[PDB]
Design a binder for this molecule. Sequence first.
Ligand SMILES: *[C@H](C)C1=C(C)C(=O)N[C@@H]1Cc1[nH]c(/C=C2N=C(/C=C3/NC(=O)C(CC)=C3C)C(C)=C\2CCC(=O)O)c(CCC(=O)O)c1C
Ligand SMILES: *[C@H](C)C1=C(C)C(=O)N[C@@H]1Cc1[nH]c(/C=C2N=C(/C=C3/NC(=O)C(CC)=C3C)C(C)=C\2CCC(=O)O)c(CCC(=O)O)c1C
Lengths: 162, 162
Amino acid sequence: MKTPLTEAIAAADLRGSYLSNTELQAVFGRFNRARAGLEAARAFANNGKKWAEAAANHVYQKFPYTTQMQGPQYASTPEGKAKCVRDIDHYLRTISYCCVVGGTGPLDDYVVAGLKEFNSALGLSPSWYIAALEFVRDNHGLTGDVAGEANTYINYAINALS
Amino acid sequence: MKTPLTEAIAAADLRGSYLSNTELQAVFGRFNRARAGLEAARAFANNGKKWAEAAANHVYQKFPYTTQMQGPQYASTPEGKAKCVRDIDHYLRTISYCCVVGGTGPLDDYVVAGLKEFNSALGLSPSWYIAALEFVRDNHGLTGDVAGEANTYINYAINALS
Ligand SMILES: *[C@H](C)C1=C(C)C(=O)N[C@@H]1Cc1[nH]c(/C=C2N=C(/C=C3/NC(=O)C(CC)=C3C)C(C)=C\2CCC(=O)O)c(CCC(=O)O)c1C
Ligand SMILES: *[C@H](C)C1=C(C)C(=O)N[C@@H]1Cc1[nH]c(/C=C2N=C(/C=C3/NC(=O)C(CC)=C3C)C(C)=C\2CCC(=O)O)c(CCC(=O)O)c1C
């Protein structure tokens, strides 16, 4: 998949030239955010399970039909509910990868070139996952630079599902 | 193109796990090596053509026939000599990329894949290039961890060409 480093080398290789100082300065300056993105990667790995399970609960309360209705796409069973926390934990895992990379690549390949394609042959609602992500955005308790990265990718995923 | 960061994420994404404490430690301690990777890239971007000029001349001297022989693969004309400089510059350009990334990726794609399978049809000798590569190694004037990264990758190119 793509990262801004893989993109910058790919572009400079296509025109057969070295990376100029200005292209090389945008690699020097993204090491401030990538240091912050490594604390966010270590924060997501620490509380991800509990955040995902707490996020699942909010969705169940916000959309009570999901826990009582039919059964193919609905969390009517305790097995279906387990699958919801796993689906949510997966977003949190992909968002952590984006923070380590300093780009949207991991999400671009999971949601845009992934989820938005086959959900026509599944029928789950994006709103269930936007609410889950809004809950983890407003309840993670992260600092400043660390919060910056986590909130950039959580918000990119929310909008990718739009 | 493979980078050690894109293989790290790719690997954990197949297990459906967050990057562990120690997988993140192999990314953290790379900031000293990646800083040396960007200075080495700057050095190649600055003197590259001059080194490719001095390397080409050393080749015409070790192998005097490449200057006075046949015609298809030889630098027997000033148009042929200019191509030799260009092929050497390409190596130095691909080496500069590996330095920035912190992995052999750019070289694997250029030397192993492509060059070694298509040269069977072109007939050029890997020897002339190993000899131009050893000359930029022996007298680039670089020192410290910058010479380390540069020599790691210059030695990877020489290796792959065998
Ligand atoms: C969790 C928000 C949730 C609620 C509240 C609910 O009623 N159902 C649901 C849990 C659930 N998920 C599946 C199956 C899948 N979910 C997937 C992931 C998606 N994430 C999205 O944002 C989205 C819409 C764009 C998805 C489709 C996927 C890919 C699957 C199927 C493939 C798989 O992972 O196995 C189910 C039902 C099927 C099952 O239990 O496996 C439920 C109940
Ligand atoms: C420079 C070392 C040199 C000397 C001293 C010489 O006599 N010939 C040669 C310069 C030269 N190169 C080409 C054409 C190509 N060079 C390519 C790159 C390679 N890098 C290698 O390490 C290697 C061996 C494994 C190569 C073959 C390639 C891919 C080509 C062909 C395609 C292209 O880029 O044009 C020529 C021939 C002139 C021509 O343009 O075909 C010479 C003379």
